[PDB]
Design a protein around this ligand. Structure first.
Ligand SMILES: c1ccc(-c2cncc(N3CCCNCC3)c2)cc1
Ligand SMILES: c1ccc(-c2cncc(N3CCCNCC3)c2)cc1
Ligand SMILES: c1ccc(-c2cncc(N3CCCNCC3)c2)cc1
Ligand SMILES: c1ccc(-c2cncc(N3CCCNCC3)c2)cc1
Ligand SMILES: c1ccc(-c2cncc(N3CCCNCC3)c2)cc1
Ligand SMILES: c1ccc(-c2cncc(N3CCCNCC3)c2)cc1
Ligand SMILES: c1ccc(-c2cncc(N3CCCNCC3)c2)cc1
Lengths: 202, 205, 201, 199, 206
């Protein structure tokens, strides 16, 4: 198989609408935010404008191929792949995807989608101008798939990719996993809560 | 049937353009707004900028499948489904859908669609910076289907509903009420149903 | 015929690019604007931001069906229909369509399309703060079809106007016009909508 | 042939991606701007926001039909036609097309496309508040087709009386430019808009 | 072959999703930016709004045709072609493409794509209103393809810095330099190439 054959096969047979659950197990989705920039902060409105790497990982075995004498990875448009229906619960603008919308697919069926995203959020901006800084929390989870269909899990220097030219600096980033039941649905929905501790530079 | 078969079948036979009236009855559409945020308010122009979840429910039997030994629910892109043509009459921007545009479909044909939407409305902002607050009314109904084709009703509430509102808003919600109306417009002979959602809110002090 | 059959037929024989003229007569298009709101007015720049329902009506016999024992109306996506190529000549933004883009089609072939639209126009804003108000004129006609192909005609002044606007409507009138531009031999029809409005006391 | 047949034929055979050269002669494209409005002018940044009709004309013989007993013109979506790949070199926003994107096609293959466009340009705004006014130049040509493939040539009265500005004069010049990156000449039309603020 | 045949063939067989690697070797992609305008600069936020021609060049042999008695070049919509998945790492808006999205394809398979782009970047704006000027650095590379799949060539030949630069900008260009970098990201284990373009500019002030 060359890349042309692999991509032809994926295009003809991937079902982008079909969640790739195996044996009534959930699809395990890894989520991790790498902050690139903090562009605007409003301590009165409690709004922030940030740019982050949304590093997203999952397995889809229907994509797998024998790579014994073949490329073991290809890049694939996400329009030809199933992708998890993740959303930030406290976002107040839609995600502005800054980068080409291609995922990397490994021959064992591992998919890695890592777009750079600019988005506005409602969160706690108090303390942004102090030693301890502000802590803005961002919840991301599957919009329509409960915990028996999609599980989300944090994977893991916090400023590695953070712009040195921002007016802000990152003090710390922590992630944590949540299982929430909402009074109107019987099942639990998982999210990752990302806490960004940052402050205005001096 | 596995999920792949169910979604294949739906994709091949949905008929997204066809309102699923059963016999000669209206499609019963449930609608309810859960407010997530109030972002901007202007008392001189009587405009508000708001984020809400638009909880929407209806039945489409053409989607039903035998779930005896199968998944009883799947997620489906709304582009593959008939969806009610709802609109807010006093909206002054088009809905900005913040979330993935997927509905949940149950094996008995029940459809649940709930996008998170940011939108601007024209409404009564007077009193917002007082203790009794302002009362903004949002009117939602089918744009082109009269009452014999689509009926709209509020869903019954959850104890949780008041708690999706952001604690970080400059504003706080005092109360949310809903009400069903049937209006006849001068341009058209039949009645059109809407739900009016009254949002009583004020600036935090 | 049920609705599924009607909509299948419309979709399958869908000729959205083909103007439905009958017998070498023009397609008669009705248009009227129902003003919903006036959001922003600038008397220095002579610009207004408005919300209106664009009530549009025409006949397309290729859509017709025998409704003797069938629904006599269906809702149809305008993407599956021919639609007159109307434009406001003094618009300075593209139309922002606020509603689902569905038209109502009657079994005799009549089509009724009435979207809510937000749009900005260049027009006379002088006198908006006076008692007689300003009069803003909105010119609407077919962009590319002359009078032998499309004719345009008019279809309560504030039955739908928002009570929460900073403005009030004093009067709305419509005149028809037929214009031969220096660019083309044929005449093009338009409707002129005059909106007389003022800032509330 | 009725309109339905003509439009069916065009939709099936028009090759929107294929430049309609005949006998290795350039496609002759006429372009002219009719100014409708000047909305915003910035003396700080040297930017102007203007609305114009972009009157564009060319011949595509593959569209032609026998019109002896048929309509001699139809309106056609530009998505079904080859369109010259014109761009304004000093534009700083993409063209906002205000009107239905339909062209008029004549039975001999002549195409006439004239959208109303709102667009923002970088140009000389100095003098906008004097009697002599400012002169803003807009340069338009084919982005990727040189002079042996596309030639461009020139083809007040529609200007809004409600603009804060008035037009003193519009002139049009044609140029043939060779750029560093490329061996062939590219043609453009330069439109000079002499305008001023009304007092 | 006439143009119609060449374009038909390209439309029928180009695999837009398939990177045109020969063997195990990378597709060499050339990238250079020609600055057209600097529209807005914010020294407090360290943000700039710029317009440039993003001259992009690569080879795709699957597009090649015998041009002995045929046109040796055609213009082709990029939607019918594989194009490299380049992104500016410090962009804070998506690219606003100002021009028709057509690439020029030569009969040997060389592709030349040169759109005019307006985009906002986060970078060092300090010194913009001084004589020595600011230096804003723009980083562009393949988003998902490592160095064995795409190499980015920043090299230049006979370029001048202000040739296409607008005389009506509030800013002037002092110098433009290009440089290649190779980085290993903590996400993955391979090297990824980028071009770093350094724009030395200042506010006009004489
Ligand atoms: C059963 C009933 C409703 C939904 C459903 C559809 N569409 C959005 C949601 N959401 C609420 C659950 C938690 N995630 C936020 C969105 C749920 C799914 C399964
Ligand atoms: C017959 C029945 C309805 C319509 C129709 C189409 N398109 C918008 C409307 N509207 C008035 C009804 C209430 N909803 C607001 C808009 C009506 C046309 C013909
Ligand atoms: C405080 C009080 C109410 C709400 C609130 C927001 N958003 C929807 C509701 N609901 C309950 C009332 C019944 N109708 C709609 C659902 C309540 C938030 C904070
Ligand atoms: C929008 C607003 C709130 C939440 C939200 C997230 N995470 C936990 C909660 N809550 C915990 C108890 C369950 N009911 C609602 C309150 C709410 C999500 C989206
Ligand atoms: C022959 C007849 C009409 C047109 C034509 C194309 N495209 C815009 C127009 N317009 C002038 C007519 C009335 N509407 C304004 C724009 C005309 C072209 C060739
Ligand atoms: C060979 C010849 C021309 C181009 C080409 C592609 N794409 C934009 C240009 N431009 C410069 C020429 C004049 N038009 C401005 C843009 C040239 C590529 C390869
Ligand atoms: C294997 C190889 C590459 C990726 C991959 C996917 N998606 C974005 C990246 N990035 C890091 C490489 C340099 N460009 C920034 C984005 C890498 C995933 C698995």
């Amino acid at each position: 198989l060359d890349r042309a054959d692999i991509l032809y096969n994926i295009r003809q047979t991937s079902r982008p609408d079909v969640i790739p659950t195996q044996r009534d197990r959930p699809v395990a989705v890894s989520v991790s935010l790498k902050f690139i920039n903090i562009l605007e902060v409003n301590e009165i409105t409690n709004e922030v404008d940030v740019v982050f790497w949304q590093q997203t990982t999952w397995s889809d075995r229907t994509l797998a191929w024998n790579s014994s004498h073949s490329p073991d990875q290809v890049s694939v448009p996400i329009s030809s792949l199933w992708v998890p229906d993740l959303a930030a619960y406290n976002a107040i603008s839609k995600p502005e995807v800054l980068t080409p919308q291609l995922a990397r697919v490994v021959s064992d069926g591992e998919v890695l989608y890592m777009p750079s995203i600019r988005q506005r959020f409602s969160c706690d901006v108090s303390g942004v101008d102090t030693e301890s800084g502000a802590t803005c929390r961002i919840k991301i989870g599957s919009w329509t798939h409960h915990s028996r269909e999609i599980s989300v899990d944090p994977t893991t220097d916090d400023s590695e990719y953070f712009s040195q030219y921002s007016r802000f600096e990152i003090l710390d980033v922590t992630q944590k996993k949540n299982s929430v039941t909402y009074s109107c649905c019987p099942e639990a929905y998982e999210d990752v809560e990302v806490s960004l501790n940052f402050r205005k530079k001096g």
